Amino acid sequence: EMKPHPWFFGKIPRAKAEEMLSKQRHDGAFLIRESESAPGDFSLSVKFGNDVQHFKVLRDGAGKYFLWVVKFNSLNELVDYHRSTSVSRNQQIFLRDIEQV
Template identity: 70%
Template sequence: MEAVAKHDFVATAEDELSFKRTQILKVINMDDDQNWYRAELDGKEGLIPSNYIEMRPHEWYCGHLTRADAESTLKQQKQEGAFLIRASESSPGDFSLSVKCGNEVQHFKVLRDTQGKFFLWVVKFNSLNELVQYHKSHSVSRSQEIFLRDMVMTEQMVVAHYDFTPQESNELEFRRGDILRIVDKESSSQWWTAELRGRQGLIPSTYVTAYLAESA
């Protein structure tokens, strides 16, 4: 995930990362502390204050979506090449690219070199966004031609922007980055009924936004 710096920041501890206003940082981890994120800039990693940056979310980034949920989501897509990028389950801080290929879903590990550049094969990129744009016209697979295509989703799919811990038994727990299916949002503007991993419950509508707008 990328973020743009709103202010200059000078590190005061060894584990912090200095940056200048308008610089683009790669945010690696937002889960350990809501006030301090782990990020990377020019090949260096460190902690940055979350209120000094503005996130630049992409519709294809799904955060902590599991491999199984990624497959379930993509198998509902009609077009070849429908894709999403998610946080790696097996390698924290890394990313996985999941792509619909025929009736199956293939998963590619997004590799990174010592300079922090992202790549699948040979060509390297400064950001995930650059990698995605490149592979919309260059195959992600070496065994067959598969080009990345944006998913077409309905507004009934939403992405969580914050963690939510239920206070009542009829509420549904979720984490930032989870993709939920909205079952009912007519009964209340503040609390919607949603489904996640086979469980249903109420969620606060202000914690989520439409996952993907419909597109051709």
Template identity: 30%
Template sequence: MDLPYYHGPLTKRDCEILLLREGVDGNFLLRDSESVPGALCLCVSFKNLVYTYRIFKQKQGCYSMETAEDAQKQVFPSLKELISKYEKPHQGLVVHLLNPIMRTSRNLGWRRVKISQDDNYENGNNDYVRVLP
């Protein structure tokens, strides 16, 4: 994937470290989902938490984001267009996307790490959110 803010198999914990270290609302990145094979996660920081939205690739090569039950599902021809929409305020995310966290040579080597149940960090296991109407 040729997007500079796509981090591949970045763990949830490593993602939170990257997004929260500057304390800026609207930091975001894309990563592979750890729990849903083939899905992507759009992760965005807001008020010292990381909100994660699942993105699914459709059969036609388009992309859609998991939405609230009563919200109309939107389909985007590319990830770039999906991101572009959510860079605008009031599109259903907790905060609009402001600052992409780019891959660097230092974080290209991220790998999955085993997280024990004793590890503490801000978000819980069920913190995927849906786009609101």
């Protein structure tokens, strides 16, 4: 039952992440991509209404990952944490997997 995650898109451009997410029906649909403007950093792109919001994946000194305050030993834990705690300080948006073709 071991499957790869449906949310890791590697190095897709910010704009293509917006393109792909715009077609998703449900708020919270998201992906992790490897930033092109900041190589070696990740970004989290999320559908909300007619918009796609982007969040920097930030790192502490020890290489933990975070968006705001709570930090995680992995992108995988950061993603899962934010399935039930909002990614946004403006709306209640919870990560949910893309509907896959």
